[PDB]
Amino acid sequence: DWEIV
Amino acid sequence: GPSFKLEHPLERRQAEAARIREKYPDRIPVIVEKAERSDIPDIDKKKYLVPADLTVGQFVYVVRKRIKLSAEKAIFIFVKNILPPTAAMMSAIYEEHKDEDGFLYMTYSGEN
């Protein structure tokens, strides 16, 4: 679960 | 405090790094965790995929949006206890400081 900046 | 390496052995970390860097080739995977000695609140999210040319300062703002602090309270983000330059690109920080596992580890604190 990665925050796409 | 820093927990990602506590909670996952090298093999799982490297595998996740490889997975994500293949899926997003131009992004830098960053792990942001609370500095060991700080009582600042938790941030909403630990794992960030950042564009390579995002600046450090733009990233600090990104992180500050994911925490609840009264307006007078400070935040600081460190890489291996160095305060990086807000004008630097995340790509340069990654080159200097990336971990063996492929991630860039940063900490945040209410104290500098």
Author numbering:
A (entry chain C): 1 to 5
B (entry chain B): 3 to 114
Manuscript excerpt for this entry:
The P. infestans RXLR-type effector PexRD54 (PITG_09316) perturbs host-selective autophagy for the benefit of the pathogen via interaction with ATG8CL. Recently, a P. infestans RXLR effector, PexRD54, which contains an AIM sequence Trp-Glu-Ile-Val “WEIV” positioned at the C terminus (residues 378–381), was identified. It was shown that PexRD54 specifically interacts with a member of the ATG8 family of proteins from potato, ATG8CL, in vitro and in planta. In plant cells, PexRD54 activates selective autophagy by increasing the number of ATG8CL-containing autophagosomes and stabilizing ATG8CL.
Therefore, to visualize the interaction between PexRD54 and ATG8CL, we determined the crystal structure of ATG8CL in complex with a PexRD54 C-terminal pentapeptide. This pentapeptide includes the AIM motif, with residues Asp-377–Trp-378–Glu-379–Ile-380–Val-381. To produce crystals of ATG8CL + pentapeptide, we used an ATG8CL construct lacking four N-terminal residues and five C-terminal residues. The structure of the complex was solved by molecular replacement and refined to 1.90 Å with final Rwork and Rfree values of 17.6 and 19.9%, respectively. The final model contains two molecules of ATG8CL + pentapeptide in the asymmetric unit. The structure of ATG8CL contains two domains, an N-terminal helical domain (α1 and α2) and a C-terminal domain that adopts a β-grasp (ubiquitin-like) fold of four β-strands (β1–β4) flanked by two helices (α3 and α4). In the complex, the pentapeptide adopts an extended conformation forming a parallel β-sheet with β2 of ATG8CL. The side chain of PexRD54 Trp-378 is contained within a hydrophobic pocket formed at the interface between the β-grasp and N-terminal helical domains of ATG8CL, whereas the side chain of PexRD54 Val-381 binds a distinct hydrophobic pocket between β2 and an adjacent helix on the C-terminal domain of ATG8CL. In addition to hydrophobic interactions, the indole nitrogen of Trp-378 forms a hydrogen bond with the side chain of ATG8CL Glu-18. The side chain of PexRD54 Glu-379 makes hydrogen bonds and ionic interactions with the side chains of ATG8CL Lys-47 and ATG8CL Arg-68.
